[PDB]
Amino acid sequence: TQQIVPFIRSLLMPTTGPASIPDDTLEKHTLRSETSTYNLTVGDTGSGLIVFFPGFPGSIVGAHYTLQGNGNYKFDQMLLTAQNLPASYNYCRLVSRSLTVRSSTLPLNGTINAVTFQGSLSELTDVSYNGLMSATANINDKIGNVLVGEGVTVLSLPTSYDLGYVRLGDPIPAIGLDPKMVATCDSSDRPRVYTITAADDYQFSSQYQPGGVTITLFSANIDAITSLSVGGELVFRTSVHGLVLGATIYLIGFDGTTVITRAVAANNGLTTGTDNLMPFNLVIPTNEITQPITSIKLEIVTSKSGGQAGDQMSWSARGSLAVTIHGGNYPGALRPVTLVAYERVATGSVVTVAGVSNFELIPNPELAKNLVTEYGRFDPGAMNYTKLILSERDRLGIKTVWPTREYTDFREYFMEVADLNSPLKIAG
């Protein structure tokens, strides 16, 4: 520390403002801060979960779920940046981010558990208040039973530098006959791909039914916050004449709710002694994803034209699907997740979220006319200092989740120099 190092200051105290990342990604950019402010209402059980995406390169900060009588979560709302970055910028990179979670009202109240998990949302094996505590072995990535009144601070720590600029989901110039037409340029670099072999000569056998017989061929945990696509093909064989197949893909939210439902093939006759192809050509736009996607499943309906008492409908199925979630493997886009769980909070009280997110940004064409961009400030040793700090992360006690009181202490313990500027004022 001398004066200090703008980037370290920004990284460890994001509410302080942005600084350019001192890596090798030399783009002309501009630096911005976006606040997040939410007043969430506590449900009947007095318990709930905030899912944060600490590294998300853009306006999505997290999602809030209340816990319900029956032990299920129920989606409340997305937690966003104050304004929608893709409306003004085309490219983006996360510099630093911190968020605060505490109670502010009573209609001395409940506790919080928090973890930073090194995987995407659907990968967590246990998301209960208590179960959170073992999502990492890292002591500085979990905090237990912090009083809600005092609150918790979530600090975003890096998962890789020299990251590319991410395209935001920015609207692209387009005209179309449909009012509800939407055209964007999506986060794409570093896609995540899931491959699901749904069937390898899977035999299906069942008696006839008016209305048909529905099965769930498979269900698989995947993650999506933004646009994705499904490709691939199932091949069906049969000895039985006049079978008609229906198939639907469901994308399921964290709360078990159907987020998106897409008929992949409806009313589709099967021919005897031949391959019957069922292609998958699904594109799911960002705006359709009303809450984080947690799993995908495929249902198949089998029915017969004629039909009787005992008819026995049978088919064989083979094939694999590929689920590409665009930009999904970009560190921060899905990957690190910070969960903040609260319980025993009085029903009707307010859980207050306040955060600052800092970005390197490239303006969209209209803003670029009035927004000057520059290469980052050069200070050598900024990156080495960051590397040193992170290297000593555990001995310094630099947490991703803090009791706010401890984070406040840390701020003043660190940051003991901010020294005006000695004789520039008297120099010459």
Q: Which of residues 152-181 bind Ca ion (CB under 5 A)?
A: 162
Residue 44, annotated ligand binder?
no
Who's near 333: CB < 8 A, 6+ residues apart? 53, 55, 56, 57, 166, 187, 190, 225, 226, 327
User: How many Å apart are CA 225 and CA 333, to the nearest integer?
Assistant: 8
7 binds, among a second copy, Ca ion, none (CB under 5 to 8 A by kind): none
CB 338 within 8 A of CB 401: yes
Q: Where are the alpha helices (DSSP H) in 119-263?
A: none
Closest by CA to 187, choosing from 224, 221, 133, is: 224
Tell which positions 10-49 bind Ca ion, by CB under 5 A.
24
Nearer to a second copy, 308 or 396 (CB): 396
CA atoms of 141 and 52, how far apart (whole Å)? 13
Greatest alpha-carbon pair distance for the chain in Å reads 103
For residues 138 and 133, give the distance between their C-alpha atoms in angstroms, rounded to a whole number.
10
Query: How far is Cα 101 from Cα 110, in angstroms, rounded to an integer?
Result: 13
Name the segment binding a second copy (CB under 8 A); options: 66-74, 250-258, 262-270, 305-313: 262-270
Name the minimum Å distance from CB 126 to a second copy. Answer: 9
Q: Is 279 an interacting residue with respect to a second copy (CB under 8 A)?
A: yes
Return the residues of window 319-348 that contact a second copy according to CB under 8 A.
319-322, 324, 326, 328-329, 331, 343-344, 346
Query: What is the pattern of x (binds a second copy, CB under 8 A) and - over residues 98-117?
Result: --x-x-xxx-xxxx-x---x
Minimum gap (Å) between residue 387 Cβ and Ca ion: 11
- By CB under 5 A, residue 419 contacts Ca ion: no
Per CB under 8 A, contacts with a second copy among 156-215 are 158-162, 164-165, 167, 172-178, 180-186, 188-202, 204, 215
Instruction: Report 353-372 residues binding Ca ion (CB under 5 A).
Output: none
For the beta sheet containing 337-343, the strands, ordered from the edge strand earlier in sequence to the opposite edge, are 73-80, 60-67, 48-52, 337-343, 111-117, 142-147
Among Ca ion, a second copy, none, partner that 215 touches (CB below 5 to 8 angstroms by kind): a second copy
**Footprint of Ca ion (CB under 5 A):** 24, 162
Which residues belong to the annotated binding site? 23
**Binding site for a divalent metal cation, residues?**
23
